[PDB]
Design a protein around this ligand. Structure first.
Ligand code: CA
Ligand code: CA
Ligand code: CA
Ligand code: CA
Ligand code: ZN
Ligand code: ZN
Lengths: 535, 535
DNA sequence: CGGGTTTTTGTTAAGGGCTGTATCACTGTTTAAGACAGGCCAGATC
DNA sequence: GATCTGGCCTGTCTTACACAGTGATACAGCCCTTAACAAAAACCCG
DNA sequence: CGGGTTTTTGTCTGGCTTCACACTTGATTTGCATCACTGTTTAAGACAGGCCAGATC
DNA sequence: GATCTGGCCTGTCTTACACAGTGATGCAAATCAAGTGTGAAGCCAGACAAAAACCCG
């Protein structure tokens, strides 16, 4: 309810004095019940012990700088940052859902008194937010950016009998209140030095606990958990940055296969994922070393635009959210270009196209009340992307064979969108999946011919991904929509709301508070209560 | 507690599902319990009727523009503004404090069923809070201002037999939560045409209900109320604006006596109070008409600086908040001067000035943790005006006697501060009240002799009001602290909060929501629920 | 008026468990509008 | 050409222009109990 | 070890009890959806020509 | 002289950067409000007779 302590105390004492009873509990009984829900409360132990990681079990909110050298002699740093220790936070996230683990265990007809090697599958994701500053006073202070690194327990399995059974699977994976916060920093997500300064310890802890087993007493008996991390909720820019690629405008487009934007137009769907992390460390080594004594423009070809040391280990994936938003903006542009009738007379001016845009947006907020937006958002993408939109915009272009072509294009795009928009297209839409190959090869066909005034050279990133990589990503990892960044893209509102209503402005405590409240919010032993009206 | 409706409903359904009972009430129950506490619910009857005011009794929140013609052909107005009708507001206030004034008659050994002509004494306060905007997106561009005209039932008094007994007196007169809001608008306080367009109807209503008697059934038996309005919650700026006086930096300084700054410095404390509202209207008539055919520079002597038509009827009084802030800032200036020994070597340059300022700032921050600031608030003025602060700053002057010449000065200013700052100096500090004349006269001598290097010509306005008019404003009104703008100055907080936490962004509903919620917050039938824990 | 009784009450101090409220460290990071007085140029004028 | 006078420009001044609200910590009451000893009306009993 | 002493149960037929509960039908409350409205661009970075300007044969 | 080439200038094109939350309406479902006599689930009757948990020769 985003109440504060003074307001909760007002309500407490008022209900108490009126009713006579004590319906709400006092504040200290909330601090005590809170100590149980943060990390740093339960006893756990690793085996073998974690290399370079402490052994204590009461480690709460650590300073994020990790003892970063802060004097007037080292590289200047003022980015305040708080975090959890990865292992203790993961333990807390598991004993926050002990009850659901046990319930799923019973549901799968398993002996509730079991302690097998529970294989957890976590999905971690960082996403830098912008302009988290405010106006606490008479002044427009400054642009202030933040970065949240967060994770989520995606799926818990056990190796019972001779197989694996889902003891637990996240209901809505990319939701604002199942993405647990792990690190909060106030820094530009492209300030590579400070970013690595903050995130290096977390990657260290992650690499450490990737190779051991966690003993944790869970409701009586102790259980042994094994972890498998999957960094997937990184948007395209953060993938190209952390993994050590060149910026998005390069010749090398796909962060999953090493193909060049040009040759990605002569051949649209015959690629295969070949951009791992080990290979990219190897390619950076070849770059920095240059053992074949090549020129810059030959060494680039040798190492496929890798000119930086891969920092975090991500996995090849496509970010369904930004994939769909980019496709929608792309279609907005193609609608404008169809209005301009460019397929017959090219090379208009830098204002004829603006007039075409005016035509389009007037017609749209006259035939749909679809208000124009200068920043493409998923809402405008859902509203735009319909067969009704070509149904409308057909009456703005003179020829009708363009109606036919664009109608067919929209048909194929909507016929394939669910396969990467769902959260389990193996069962939710298996016909679309088993026909994706054909329904996208013909989409590429019709992009080759009836739009070659655009797709002769440059074909954008997300179209290449959407067309050529989706089926094998599915055959590799189940779905595409679940493994996305929508979860970490919602919590910006929570960040701002907590920093406004529940904080202490001290610039040192003021971040512990946000981190703590967002942790509590995304808890589950509490959502069990706030969802009590569903019996 | 400032809950939304979604949040309140969430808490409601949670408690209902957990407990199983129903402690909180559904939203519709609260809307029904709200329709009773807003104005435009009870029946009332003016006798004789109110000239130019309707007779309906169910008029609540209405467009503040009062049907101001808004076409392309009229003077363009764009200010959103909501208001209550003044009589409806007073009726709701009275049948809100019904229980309290019944208890008052009980305590005063009167009859519950007594229907004497209750004379009410209401305070009027209008304050133009500024910068009430927030950044919705990107761009700090537009600052927007606001104005809230409000009132406060200050005392209620029945004329039992042949004596007036105080059935009710406000405990905290200038408090956050008894200043009932009446009208509020988004417009500069000095956009004089808009301000008059909005406040002309309200003035019409408060002029209508000055020769009538509200008949209102209160706890069964009907009662006859009869009003006295006093406009006092006005900062110097609006006083001068809506009385038809020259801007505050003129030669005619006091809004109570018509005297020149030079003559104020020659004669420090012997003035009377000789500037009413009818006198202002009559002097404006002299101005506009110019009956004696004389040039501007002696006509302005004839009309003592009245060159505009008076708009509202305010009373001759001094604010207290701005009074002590101004006097404290003037002592701060005297300190910056004494550090530099301006008396020995006058006419320095505009670098030693800032040097003196930074000297005093660093010194005070070192000695008292009194971190300096630019906008001098009330906490700064509170801390700075202490005998300890002069005892500290006294260690920065090479002189031997300026020590005592500041010690005595601060001594007398402190002997004077309670006299006006008190909400009833008669029975809180009558010794200060009977010595105030002597203390102010000695203070005046001290400024005139050991500080003539500053107060030879210019003497600021507040060192005229404070010095020469307090011992008569007291004898005319009682206190000075009660009749002040603090109650309104505080409510500004609430506005901003409401405007972001309880509103509809509709730019038409988004203001009546703020106004309704502020009326509720200011109610009393609810404050004696949120104060149940004490009693 | 008493006067044995009830019938209930007043009191002590240590230590703890609990609860309610006050206190604490801390965060804003220059005004804008108008009045008047010089002072110096700048042009009107003898 | 010399001189008298007004206009413009800065420059000082005087009124305003958003700090109470956040979580955490610290006291200050305040009741429960040991065990006994004494104390206001409540009231028949004499 | 299997046999024996606790807690704990079945157990009496009677009369008792509170209270759910039959069976309408409209006047209320309560739940859960809708609804109209709000924000009013880019900012770094890659690649490509193209023009010009200075170098070189 | 004549041309080549390299540097700077825009000029497009790529990924990215803030919309669910406000108070209001408005129908569907629930309940509930009486009627009046029912039976049903326990209550408890002091005292008596077949089982689980553990002592005991
Ligand atoms: Ca991002
Ligand atoms: Ca994001
Ligand atoms: Ca003001
Ligand atoms: Ca104010
Ligand atoms: Zn690819
Ligand atoms: Zn005066």
């Amino acid at each position: 309810t985003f109440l504060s302590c003074s307001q909760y105390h007002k309500m407490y004492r008022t209900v108490k004095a009126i009713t006579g009873r004590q319906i709400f509990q006092p504040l200290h009984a909330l601090r005590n019940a809170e100590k149980v829900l943060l990390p740093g409360y339960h006893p756990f132990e690793w085996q073998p012990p974690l290399k370079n990681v402490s052994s204590r079990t009461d480690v709460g909110i650590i300073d994020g700088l990790s003892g970063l050298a802060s004097s007037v002699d080292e590289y200047p740093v003022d980015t305040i940052a708080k975090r959890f220790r990865y292992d203790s936070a993961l333990v807390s996230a598991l004993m926050d859902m002990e009850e659901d683990i046990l319930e799923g265990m019973r549901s799968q007809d398993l002996d509730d008194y079991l302690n097998g090697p529970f294989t957890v599958v976590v999905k971690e994701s960082c996403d830098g937010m912008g302009d988290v500053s405010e106006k606490h006073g008479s002044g427009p202070a400054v642009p202030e950016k933040a970065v949240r690194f967060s994770f989520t327990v995606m799926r818990i399995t056990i190796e019972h009998g001779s197989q694996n059974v889902k003891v637990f699977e996240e209901p809505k994976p990319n939701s604002e209140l199942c993405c647990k916060p792990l690190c909060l920093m106030l820094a530009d997500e492209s300030d590579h030095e400070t970013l690595t300064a903050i995130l290096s310890p977390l990657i260290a802890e992650r690499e450490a606990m990737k190779s051991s087993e966690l003993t944790l007493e869970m409701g009586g008996i102790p259980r042994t958990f094994k972890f498998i991390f999957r960094g997937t909720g990184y948007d395209e820019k953060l993938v190209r940055e952390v993994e050590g690629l060149e910026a998005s405008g390069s010749v090398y487009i796909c962060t999953l296969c090493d193909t060049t934007r040009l040759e990605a137009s002569q051949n649209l769907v015959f690629h295969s994922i070949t951009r791992s992390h080990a290979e990219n460390l190897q390619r950076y080594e070849v770059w920095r070393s240059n053992p074949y004594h090549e020129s810059v423009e030959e060494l680039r070809d040798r190492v496929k635009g890798v000119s930086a040391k891969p920092f975090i280990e991500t996995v090849p994936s496509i970010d369904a959210l930004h994939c769909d938003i980019g496709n929608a903006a792309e279609f907005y542009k193609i609608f404008q270009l169809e209005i301009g009738e460019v397929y017959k007379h090219p090379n208009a001016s830098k204002e004829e196209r603006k007039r075409w845009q005016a035509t389009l947006d007037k017609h749209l907020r006259k035939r749909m009340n679809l208000k124009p937006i200068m920043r493409m958002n998923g809402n405008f993408a859902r509203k735009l992307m319909t067969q009704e939109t070509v149904d409308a915009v057909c009456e703005l272009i003179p020829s009708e064979e363009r109606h036919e072509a664009l109608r067919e294009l929209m048909d194929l795009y909507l016929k394939m969108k669910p396969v990467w928009r769902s959260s389990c297209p193996a069962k939710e839409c298996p016909e679309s999946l088993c026909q994706y190959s054909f329904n996208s090869q013909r989409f590429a066909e019709l992009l080759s011919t009836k739009f070659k005034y655009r797709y002769e050279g440059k074909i954008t990133n997300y179209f290449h991904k959407t067309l050529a990589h989706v089926p094998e990503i599915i055959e590799r990892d189940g779905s595409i929509g679940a493994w996305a960044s929508e979860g970490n893209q919602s919590g910006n509102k929570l960040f701002r709301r907590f920093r406004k209503m529940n904080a202490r402005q001290s610039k040192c405590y003021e971040m512990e508070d946000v981190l703590k409240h967002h942790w509590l919010y995304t808890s589950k032993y509490l959502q069990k209560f706030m969802n009590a009206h569903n019996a």
